[PDB]
């Protein structure tokens, strides 16, 4: 059930599926190791859609927070992160 | 499935249940800019006197959990009232 | 589904299921803090949040309520409280 | 549906109806600035610590049973209000 | 229905299933301690890289929600890098 992954900050990460869809439930972003005191932003784009910001995470402030957002699509998503250090991502299957 | 959208500052999003699903919004996050003061996030199902859903403060809030659902006949209409847009994102069922 | 109110400072607002999500600090230049409670019946009161101006505006709840006994929620200080959340 | 109980702070508690989610735990009133901490009754377990004017309720959403040790307590000058709902 | 256990600094707990149930883990909380560096939770499934799974500052975030499920056919190792233990809380199902 449980799933996570590591997106760098000039790294993406891609979501797809293989005929059937699993549900993906995304629960929290964690910030990275670093030294970086610059935020973090984790960004999402599904299809060419225009971008949605999904969390900000600034170091020594706001280092990890709650997303809960769920994830059965026909199309690619795209994670990316904005920032000098990585998000880790995790939550689980349905 | 994954739904969201970036309401502007000053402008209006209007959630339509026409052709029927259950959305539930769950995080609302503060929008790019160098503004220092507040936006809040507001609804109005009707022409209805509008309800405060959350403050997000530059540097200090700059996201939080929503976790609200809506399945109505009327339009829901979002809105921000602030320097910086909000980005909403959810999903149905 | 959606359901929501604005209990003013002054005022006491009286409630199937019903998910209450979401208390946000209302309109006001007040400083001190907002207490929301809850009375269900004869029963003593209790405390669901505390909101503080500029510090803590908002929160989450996630609480329910499907009572054959009278629910009375008030606010104990100078700036209101939108309840939001959901039936079912 | 709707649960909750004032655990004081040097009383405990003891859940003696259904499947309890404990979603919500409110500092109560009180000028005493010293932190509170709930615990969980085997060591017992922290379940959040509030400290006046800074963190004065927080999330739980934790779910228990009677048939549960359940034994709460609050070390600290003011007592923790526990909010929640019977599934 | 409850489940927690403290994870001490550096020390490692081991969640095993099988002779297989679902855990729903809720709540990270920081534990005793004068310590004021931070403490992360941090999560393995075998031999794979670990991911984090929240950062706790002492008199800052003490504690944070979760809300993560775990029903793996692999032992899942929870360890704590920091001075400071964390108590993890949840239910099964």
Same mark, same amino acid.
């Given at each position: 059930?449980?799933?996570?992954?590591?997106?760098? %900050?000039?790294?993406?990460?891609?979501?797809? /599926?293989?005929?059937? @869809?699993?549900?993906?439930?995304? *629960?929290?972003?964690? !910030?990275?190791?670093?030294?970086?005191? /610059?935020? &973090?932003?984790?960004?999402? /784009?599904? +299809?060419?859609? *225009?971008? =949605?910001? !999904?969390?900000? =995470?600034? %170091?020594?402030?706001?280092? &990890?927070?709650? !997303?809960?957002?769920?994830?059965?699509?026909?199309?690619?998503?795209?994670? &990316?992160? @904005? +920032? %000098?250090? &990585?998000?880790?991502?995790?939550?689980?299957?349905?």
């Amino acid at each position: 059930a449980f799933w996570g992954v590591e997106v760098k %900050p000039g790294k993406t990460f891609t979501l797809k /599926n293989a005929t059937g @869809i699993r549900r993906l439930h995304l *629960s929290q972003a964690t !910030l990275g190791h670093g030294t970086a005191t /610059n935020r &973090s932003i984790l960004q999402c /784009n599904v +299809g060419n859609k *225009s971008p =949605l910001l !999904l969390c900000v =995470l600034t %170091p020594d402030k706001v280092d &990890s927070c709650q !997303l809960n957002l769920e994830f059965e699509e026909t199309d690619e998503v795209i994670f &990316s992160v @904005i +920032g %000098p250090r &990585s998000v880790h991502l995790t939550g689980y299957f349905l």
